[PDB]
């Protein structure tokens, strides 16, 4: 997550 947290990375597009």
């Amino acid at each position, epitope marked *: *997550g*947290x*990375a*597009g």
Partner: antibody
Amino acid sequence: QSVEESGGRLVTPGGSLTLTCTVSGFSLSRYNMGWVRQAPGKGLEWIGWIPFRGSLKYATWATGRFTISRTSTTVDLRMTGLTAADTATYFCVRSSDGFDLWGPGTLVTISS
Amino acid sequence: DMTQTPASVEAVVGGTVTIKCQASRDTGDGLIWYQQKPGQPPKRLIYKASTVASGVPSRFKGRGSGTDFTLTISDLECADAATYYCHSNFYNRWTYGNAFGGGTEVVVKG
């Protein structure tokens, strides 16, 4: 569910201080966490983010002087080399599509 | 980094404002808005750029994607007077000096 910080106090210039975040109502193994600070009258400043798995991430200014770690029940923020520029309210946060839970904050004061 | 404009905006009760958040690097829908009243911790308003958090009224309308976002507050109430912050959570893609914008103060004119 909620989070709460502890450990804020007056710190002598150049000194070190560890803050602790204690959680209630959820599991630290299933949630990311972070730290934010706010100097009086200024904006929110992200400090870092400890995901429930993977690498820690830090603001570029915090790297090398501040570290974040976990236990099964707490997360901490270990600060070194504190100066009056670090005087602020420090918040721990639960992170889950953004900071959904904030502590009341704990105050770190370096006296000039 | 994250740039919010205006720094402050004043609007009448019942009115509408749109405030802006610009990311220098693409942050997808990884964008959160918070409301902070002086002397209180922030409250998460909107996550995933446009999803209102539970209990938040629908007159808080987050929009945008990528590098440009807006928050529109309509039917302004005195209770909406606060500073609003945007926040990028792309920690596994970008480094940050600050993941938050600088804040927009909203002054409600009675």
